[PDB]
Every structure is written in C-alpha cells, then in structure tokens.
Design an enzyme around this catalytic site. Structure first.
Site, short mmCIF file in Angstrom:
data_model
loop_
_atom_site.label_atom_id
_atom_site.label_comp_id
_atom_site.label_asym_id
_atom_site.label_seq_id
_atom_site.Cartn_x
_atom_site.Cartn_y
_atom_site.Cartn_z
N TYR A 152 38.81 46.13 28.16
CA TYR A 152 38.83 45.88 29.59
C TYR A 152 37.42 45.84 30.19
O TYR A 152 37.09 44.92 30.94
CB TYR A 152 39.67 46.97 30.28
CG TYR A 152 39.85 46.78 31.77
CD1 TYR A 152 40.70 45.81 32.27
CD2 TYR A 152 39.18 47.60 32.67
CE1 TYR A 152 40.87 45.65 33.64
CE2 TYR A 152 39.35 47.44 34.03
CZ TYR A 152 40.19 46.47 34.51
OH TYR A 152 40.36 46.31 35.87
N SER A 204 36.06 44.78 38.69
CA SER A 204 36.48 46.17 38.61
C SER A 204 35.23 47.04 38.60
O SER A 204 34.14 46.55 38.30
CB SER A 204 37.32 46.41 37.35
OG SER A 204 37.44 47.78 37.05
#
Ligand code: NAI
Ligand code: NAI
Lengths: 270, 270
Positions: free
Chosen positions: B157, B144
């Site tokens: 995250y 990501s």
C-alpha cells in the site's frame, strides 16, 4: 552488515554504470563473491573482461529483472555457484524524459516495469530466502534524488523512484527484526537544484559511489544521500508540507481532536 | 479552479466511500455535472439511489480503471453526456495489509494496478484532452498519509501511495503552464502516529473530506493534508533526511564541490 569477505552479493544492472561500480568495489575491496545480473550479454562480457584481470570471484548471469521466473532461476544459480545471497543490490534502472503530456503507455510500462517491478521482483525473490535461512542479510535499493524532487520532463522517472523509496522505507520497518539491514541510495546524476546537480554529475565516479555504498552497508545506514547541498532546498520542500498541515490548525476540527487526546492522556495508563 | 457550477467532474471509485463523498459535494454544493466511475455495478446503483433524490446532474459509468481502452470509452461517454472533463478526481484505491515477506505477486499486481496504473490511466486519458481544449482544468490525486509514513504490514500500500505522490508532484511542475491545477489529498484512515491516526479515523466523514477537497480545488491548493497533528512527527522524519545529507558535510568531496560554485558564482553573470 559485518565481515563481508566471502559473503555473496547479487547486483542488478551490474554490467554497466553505477551498478558495475558497486560490483567492482564489493568484489575487489570488500572481497565479496559477486553475481552481476544484467539483461545485456555484451555488457556482461565487458565487465568480465575487467574482472578477469583482478583477484575476484565474480559470476555473470544474463537476466531480465522483469521476468519473475528467470529471476528465481538466476538466484538459484547464485546459490549453486557461490551460496545464499547475503547482500542484494537493486540498482538496475532506466530513464527516458519528455513532456508528461506526450508520454505513451509504452513509455510508462517500460520504466515502471524495470524501475519498480524489477526491484519488487528482486526483493520478493531474495528476502524470503534470507528470512528462511535466519542468518540476516542486507538489501540495497538504488533510487535517485528524483525520489525527493520532481523536475520538468522527469514525470515517469520521478514516479518510479518515489515508488521504490516507499518500498525501501517499508522494508526499513519490517526487516530489522530478521536482522536484515536496509539502505536507500539516492544518486544525483528551483533552477538551483539542476545547477547543484550538474556539479555532482561531473564529479560522480561509479567506483567512488560504490565506496559510499560499501560504507553504508558496513555501518547499516538507511539514508544514503551524500549531497549536503540539497539540504537547504529540501528544508524548503519539507516546510511546504509542514505549513500545509499547520494551515488547518485554527480550523476547529483540529481543536476537537486535540481535546479528545488530552482527555485520553488522562483517564488511561500512558 | 473557479466557477465550478455546470463544469464537468470525473470521479473514480465514486460508487462508495471517500470518492462518493467527493461526488456528493461536487454534485450538490458545487453544482457540477458529475460522472461517477466505478467497477462495481451495485455500488453505482446504490449511489444513484441517493442522487435520484437530489437536485443533481450525475451520470454513472461502470469502469475498471485498469482497462485503458474502457477508460478512454468512459471519458468519451462523459463528453457525450455532459461535455469535456474539467475536474478529474483520481480517488479509487484498494488495500490489503500483511507482513511484506508473505506478500504474493498477485497481491502486488492487484494493488499496483488499481492504485498506481489506475491513476496513470486516468491522467493520461484526460490530461491530454484538457491541454488540447485549452480551457484549463484541474487534477486531483487521492493518495494517503502512507505517502509519508511507512507502517508495519502496509508495505505494498505504502509503495503505491508514494508512487502517485511522485506523479502528483510531477504534474505540479508541468501543468500550471496549461492552466491546469493539481491537488494531492492525503487522508489518514512511532506508536503515536497510529494513535493520532485512530483519532482522525473516528472523526472522518466522506462528505466532510469532500468539502476539504472542494475548498482545495477552488483555491488551487496542492498539499491537501488536513492534519496538523502529523507536523511534529513529519518534522522528525524530515530531520532524518536533512541530517543524513549533512552527515557528508565534513567529507572533503563536498568541500570541493563548494569551491567550484564559489568560483562559478564569480566569473559568470548571475
Ligand atoms: O548505471 P547507469 O549509468 O544509470 O545506466 P547504465 O546504462 O550505464 O546501466 C544500466 C544497466 O542496467 C541494465 N538493465 C536495463 N534494463 C534491465 C533489465 N530489465 N534487467 C536487467 N538489467 C537491465 C542495462 O543493460 C545496463 O547494463
Ligand atoms: O473509499 P474507501 O472507503 O477507501 O474504499 P471503498 O471500498 O469504500 O470504495 C472504493 C471504491 O473504489 C472501487 N474500485 C475498486 N477497484 C476499482 C477499479 N479497478 N476500477 C474502478 N473502481 C474500483 C470500488 O468498487 C469502490 O466502489
């Protein structure tokens, strides 16, 4: 963080090595009340052998940082003995190197648990207490230059240090509104990277690095990377990423996304 | 990796979203034999509903990636049904956002287990088989842009995506000598970062991103960051680090380490 005298530090891995260096500087120079937390009783005993010959307030606690229940108990103990933790130094870490294809799941779990979960466990045990108390605080995470540079045989270690770097940069975003400072120390410890590394390895002193830390905490510095050598090497690593991003420039999807913002730059207030 | 037709892909999270997009492109355009591995049976059934209307070879397997024993069994199954895995796509991931001080240990463990251990588990199950077979291979890790940018409420995250970025950069060092390629995809999905992010979010299509991946695998590209927008923002983040390193330049310890190498630059061969 200012006026460190009399404030409470909680230093993980404080029985040996880098963390002990941090403990010494904080207890002696900064005159903090320091709790050293370590899994090994004999390391604690050694450290207290030293501190028993200095004008310091140091309290040992034997703690496995991977044990969440014990961590909470150890911080409770810190509060009973000295008071609420003002400075948390997440410095304990382990390492074992080898070809990544020969790594075992036990190899992964051990290093992941201490290097990542141990830091998470400390942060989640202490930081909510800091916020609740409302008097600010400071959080140090000791990672490594392996949080920037992958090397042969350091696959597991590198993964763990990237992880806590991410955690540190995440804390950096959310902690200032609570007056909680954050520092990320990346010790050393391309064939040229290893060569530059070897030169610092030989000049590294835990007390010296402890003073670098002290200075970062006082002045609330996030990036504690005291090696100007790695700059040109890091610039090259950075340029790789920039070039990769820019390599999709001429690709018309980018030109579309350009056009949308240019319009949204008009149309709307700011 | 060349001549993908007839070669075997193992795609995690392949029942939905980004991973399904990867599976579709690999099965249809590239004509690979694709195993989609997913924890949810209903997602598998949905995907196979699609693939049953296409000229493809796709095999579903229900798998919790956090289960190491089951992972090994699932890869065995892949080998029995199609053959040895040529391309591993570690793409499954989860996320839950919130203030870091309100995160629970269950929140941490869930996201850590899927996003980090799930990738580790795949890499350690498949990559040693690739090496043993001696016919090369390719490993994709889908991280990501959170592997570069910490944001409010994305603490857990971000930590997980930094972690697998580290793992990816580590694989990048050690896999080429085995003719195993490595790719790191960082989807989007500063208040300006979020704004740039929102524009890509709205133009993102899983099949489109699947084609970006396909192109990276064919040409053996490591940095798959198809967003030239983030360049200037990333340059600033990079400069922070460079400046931090260089801020210790005038500090005489650096000048000492300078002098040692200058001498070692003389004295010795190369
Ligand atoms: O400093 P360096 O020279 O890099 O290494 P070091 O070996 O000199 O020091 C590491 C310290 O961290 C401690 N430690 C390791 N795992 C731990 C755990 N799970 N919980 C608490 N303490 C732990 C060790 O006992 C040791 O005292
Ligand atoms: O793609 P996105 O849109 O980002 O998300 P998504 O929700 O559309 O897809 C994520 C996929 O990963 C799967 N998944 C989640 N945890 C898993 C696990 N432990 N093992 C195997 N598969 C798992 C989900 O079932 C889902 O199919």
């Amino acid at each position: 963080m200012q006026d460190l005298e009399g404030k409470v530090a909680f230093v993980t891995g404080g029985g040996s090595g880098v963390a002990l260096g941090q403990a010494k500087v904080l207890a002696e120079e900064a005159q903090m009340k320091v709790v050293i937390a370590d899994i090994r009783q004999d390391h604690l005993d050694e450290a207290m052998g030293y501190f028993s010959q200095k004008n310091v307030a140091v309290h040992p606690v034997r703690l496995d940082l991977t044990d969440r229940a014990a961590y909470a108990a150890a911080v409770d103990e810190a509060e009973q003995v000295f008071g609420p933790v003002d400075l948390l130094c997440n410095t304990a870490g382990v390492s074992q190197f080898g070809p990544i294809e020969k790594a075992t799941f036990d190899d992964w779990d051990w290093q992941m648990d201490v290097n990542v979960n141990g830091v998470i466990n400390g942060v989640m045990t202490v930081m909510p207490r800091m916020i609740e108390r409302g008097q600010g605080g400071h959080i140090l995470i000791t990672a490594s230059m392996s949080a920037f540079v992958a090397l042969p045989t350091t696959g597991i270690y590198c993964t763990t240090k990237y992880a806590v770097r991410g955690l540190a940069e995440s804390l950096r975003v959310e902690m200032p509104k609570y007056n909680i400072g954050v520092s990320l120390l990346c010790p050393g410890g391309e064939a040229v990277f290893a060569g530059l590394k070897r030169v610092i390895e030989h000049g590294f002193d835990p007390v010296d690095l402890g003073r670098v830390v002290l200075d970062a905490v006082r002045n609330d510095r996030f990036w504690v990377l005291p090696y100007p050598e790695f700059a040109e090497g890091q610039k090259a690593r950075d340029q790789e990423v920039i070039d990769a991003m820019m390599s999709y420039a001429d690709h018309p999807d980018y030109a579309r996304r350009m056009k949308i913002r240019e319009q949204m730059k008009r149309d709307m207030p700011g």
